[PDB]
Write a protein that binds this ligand. Structure first.
Ligand SMILES: O=c1[nH]cc(F)c(=O)[nH]1
Ligand SMILES: [Cl-]
Length: 224
């Protein structure tokens, strides 16, 4: 399938260099199914982040891999469906840092769609995972697709802030070495890493000051 049938047109243009890789991933996933091994998130949500316009991304959030628990991952990193409770612990932790940093009330739910609609790309280094098996699709081919996405964001040389959460940070910073691109890192917000540097990192207000510094408009982070 042409990418323009799976992603927004600007993204289809940016990722055409890895279009065969994206097809190989779809082959890989269908092969996993044929072998009885499922993947998350849903096939139609795998490239969901690439359904919001390439040309409008001003903040790039990059995590590691999707939620491994069925019913959580939705193709926007860290987000959940609006009816989901309890929130996953990574999301709960992001929302405590959100209230500490911004002084906003806790969000009504865990649906981060409003961030995606406002120019925040919620990306993961690896876009699929096997249920109950964290990080189980590492090394399987998504890295070349997400490296293409990131470099192509940086090559626009429009103002861009990347928020890098967790262990891929030192790999991803060289990909963001370009004019009008700034990368800020912390430990990941998951249970056992968040209290080791995620909390206290103030990535929301920092991103907005870096944007304004470049002459860009800040993000309205406020969730309902
Ligand atoms: O690194 C991640 N952890 C948890 C997530 F939900 C996600 O999308 N990415
Ligand atoms: Cl989690």
């Amino acid at each position: 399938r042409p990418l323009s049938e799976l992603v927004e047109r600007g993204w289809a243009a940016a990722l055409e260099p890895v279009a065969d890789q994206v097809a190989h991933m779809g082959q890989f996933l269908r092969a996993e199914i044929a072998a009885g091994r499922r993947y998350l998130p849903a096939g139609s949500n795998v490239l969901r982040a690439f359904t919001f316009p390439f040309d409008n991304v001003r903040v790039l959030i990059v995590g590691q891999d999707p939620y491994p628990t069925p019913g959580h991952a939705v193709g926007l990193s860290f987000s959940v469906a609006p009816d989901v409770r309890p929130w996953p612990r990574s999301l709960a932790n992001i929302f405590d840092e959100y209230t500490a940093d911004l002084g906003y009330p806790l969000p009504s739910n865990g649906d981060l769609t409003p961030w995606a609609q406002r120019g925040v790309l919620l990306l993961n280094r690896v876009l699929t995972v096997r249920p109950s098996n964290p990080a189980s699709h590492r090394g399987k081919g998504w890295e070349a697709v997400t490296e293409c996405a990131i470099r192509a964001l940086a090559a626009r040389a429009a103002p861009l802030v990347a928020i890098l959460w967790g262990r891929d940070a030192s790999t991803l910073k060289p990909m963001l070495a370009a004019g009008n691109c700034v990368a800020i890192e912390s430990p990941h917000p998951s249970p056992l890493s968040a209290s080791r540097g995620f909390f206290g990192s103030r990535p929301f207000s920092r991103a907005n000051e870096l944007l304004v510094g470049m002459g860009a408009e800040p993000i309205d982070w406020r969730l309902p």
